[PDB]
């Protein structure tokens, strides 16, 4: 058999769950005497096949 | 924000800095069915992070190099590989006159 | 300076024939959030007509 | 064509929440006092009120 | 419920609102054996809510 | 307005032969529960016979 | 060999577990002066190959 037999069904892998809340901090908050700027960037460390 | 800064203020000077590395995800790569590769989250994979608070290692930041974070928040940063230059002894390579440190 | 590198993980070694010393293919992603404060000095007072 | 008055909004340049699988997030809002909508009609014509 | 509303009451106005986003599930899609795609719940997949 | 998107996770880069900058195929699902309260005004008193 | 040998058995992937109880809230609760209406909808945000 196969999951393709069903007309409009998609196979499932049953992964995990992680109910965490995190912030993507960005923007600048200006004040009378100072400014607090924040920027968030996604970074990627590539795979180094030999260190 | 830069327009607001240069419009509403008379001087600027850095005061404090905070860098937070979060949402870390080390990901294993394996072969995918029908060719290609697929990516799975790693629980045992680790990311080594070292903050050189003591300036033990050579400092390469602040030299105007093409290593900056992306200018737009939609792009992905690819942090540069760390390398440095150090002193040495210049030696001539044979009779050709070429010199290597 | 903040240095980042993926901790290398070793490939399997044992009863598998001619496995050899290898490394698991791992790459890291994340979100780097940088906050900088700037002390700001007020605009100098002006007395121009124009 | 875009102009200086054109508002180019980039939502990634703001603080928002990242919610993992199974997470939840709630927003609350309070409507301002608004005129109620009448659910009942009229049995008279306002021009035949004599 | 609308029939009950318009039968039992004389006026209606909005008062408050609460929007809850729960059972969030970021799901990776890869290729399953024999063609097609399969779906696996993601531990690191994040939903950006603003 | 509640804006929702999926964080664009990045594909593998490194020792794999000619990978290229790609994105992991991820889509989100969830349950959006919306609650609204309505202030209700009672039915006007009726003096009709019919 | 394979799990196909047993005609009454199917393979298992050994996925995770999540003993969580949540509510599917819906319906209207009327009162003398107000009604609290609730509706839940499953929502899907598609994969965006380019942001």
What are residue E2's phi and psi, to 5 degrees? Answer: -65, -40
**Do C and B share at least 3 CB pairs under 8 Å?**
yes
- CA E12, distance to chain mean position in Å, is 27
SS3 of chain G: helix, strand, coil, percent, to 5? 5, 30, 65
DSSP output for chain B:
-HHHHHHH-SEEEEEEEEEEEEEEEEEEEEEPTTSSEEEEE-SS--EEEEE-TT--SPP--SS--S-PPPSSTTSEE-PPPP--------EEETTTTEEE-
Beta strands A34-45 and B76-77 are parallel
Which of D30, E45, B75 lies closest to A18 in space, CA to CA? E45
Q: What is the 8-class DSSP label of residue C21?
A: S
How many CB atoms neighbour CB A47 within 10 A? 22
Handedness of CA B72, B73, B78, B84 (dihedral sign): positive
Say yes or no: F22 contacts chain E, CB-CB below 8 A: no
Q: In this structure, what is the dihedral angle of CA atoms G49, D20, A27, B52, given to the nearest 10 degrees? A: -100
Nearest to C27 by CA among D1, F36, F15: F15
Q: Residue B70's beta-bridge partner residues?
A: none
Contact C37, B13 (CB under 8 A): no
Q: How far apart are CA B59 and CA B52, in angstroms?
A: 9
Return the residue of A nearest to B1 by Cα: A28
Question: Which residues touch B101 (CB under 8 Å, ≥6 apart)?
Answer: B87, B88, B89, B90, B91
Of A42, A44, A49, the CB nearest to F15: A49
Burial class (CB in 10 A: 0-12, 13-18, 19+), A40: buried
Show residues of chain E in contact with F38, CB under 8 Å: 12-15
CB atoms within 10 A of CB F45: 6
As a dihedral over the C-alpha atoms of residue G8, residue E35, residue E24, residue B24, rounded to 10 degrees, the angle is 110
Question: What is the experimental method?
Answer: cryo-EM
DSSP character at residue F20: -
Main-chain phi, psi angles of G50, to 5 degrees: -140, 120
* Interface contact E5-G35, CB threshold 8 A: yes
> CA of F31: which chain D residue's CA is closest?
D24
Task: Count the neighbouring beta carbons within 10 Å of the beta carbon of residue B40.
Answer: 17
Q: Give the residue ranges of DSSP H helices in F1-50.
A: none
Cβ count within 10 A of residue E4: 11
With an 8 Å CB cutoff and a minimum of 3 pairs, decide whether chains C and G touch: no
Which residues have C-beta within 8 Å of that of residue B62, sequence separation ≥ 6?
A: none
Rounded to an integer, what is the distance from CA G12 to the centroid of its chain?
A: 21
3 state SS of G4: helix
The torsion region of residue B77 among left (phi > 0), alpha (psi -120 to 50) and beta comes to beta
Phi/psi for G14 (5° steps) reads 65, 45
Both tokens of G10, joined, read 């199917």
C-alpha angle E18-F4-G18 in degrees, rounded to nearest 5 = 80
Distance from CA of C19 to the nearest CA of B (A): 16
Chain F residues close to A46, C-beta within 8 Å: 12-14
**Residue of chain A nearest G19, judged by CA positions:** A17
- C-alpha angle F17/F20/F26, rounded to 5°? 115
Q: Retrieve residue B37's tokens.
A: 């590769």
Q: Which residues pair with D17 in a beta bridge?
A: A23, E49
Tell me how far apart the alpha carbons of residues C46 and C48 are, in angstroms, rounded to a whole number. Answer: 6
The torsion angles phi and psi of B7, rounded to 5 degrees, stand at -90, -35
CB A29 within 8 A of CB A36: yes
Spatial separation of the C-alpha atoms in residues A47 and C5, rounded to whole Å: 9
DSSP F16: S
Q: Which helix (H) or strand (E) holds D18?
A: strand D16-19
Pairing type for strands E47-49 and D16-19 reads: antiparallel
How big is the CA angle at D26 (ends B76 and E39), to the nearest 5 degrees? 55
Per the CB < 8 A criterion, the answer to whether E17 and F34 are in contact is: yes
Structural resolution in Å: 3.1
DSSP 8-state assignment for residue E44: S
């Amino acid at each position: 058999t196969s999951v393709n037999s069903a007309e409009a069904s998609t196979g499932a892998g049953g992964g995990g769950s992680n109910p965490v809340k995190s912030m993507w901090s960005e923007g600048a908050t200006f004040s009378a005497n100072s400014v607090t700027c924040t920027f968030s960037r996604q970074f990627l460390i590539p795979y180094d096949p030999e260190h | 924000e830069f327009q607001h800064l240069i419009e509403n203020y008379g001087s600027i000077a850095p005061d404090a800095l905070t860098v937070t590395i979060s949402e870390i995800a080390v990901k294993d790569v394996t072969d995918k069915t029908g060719g290609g590769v697929q990516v799975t989250d790693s629980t045992t994979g680790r990311l080594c992070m070292l903050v050189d608070h003591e300036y033990k290692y050579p400092y390469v930041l602040g030299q105007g190099q093409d290593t900056l974070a992306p200018e737009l928040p939609i792009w992905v940063y690819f942090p540069p590989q760390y390398a440095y230059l150090t002193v040495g002894d210049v030696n001539t390579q044979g009779i050709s006159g070429d010199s290597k440190k | 300076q903040i240095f980042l590198k993926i901790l290398p993980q070793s490939g399997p070694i044992g009863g598998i024939k001619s496995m050899g010393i290898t490394t698991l293919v791992q790459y890291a992603v994340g979100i780097m959030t940088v906050t900088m404060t700037f002390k700001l000095g007020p605009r100098k007072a002006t007395g121009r007509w124009n | 064509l875009a102009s200086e008055e054109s508002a180019f909004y980039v939502l990634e340049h703001s603080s928002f929440q990242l919610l993992g699988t199974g997470g939840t997030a709630t927003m609350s809002y309070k409507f301002p006092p608004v005129p109620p909508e009448n659910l009942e009609g009229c049995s008279q014509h306002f021009y035949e009120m004599y």
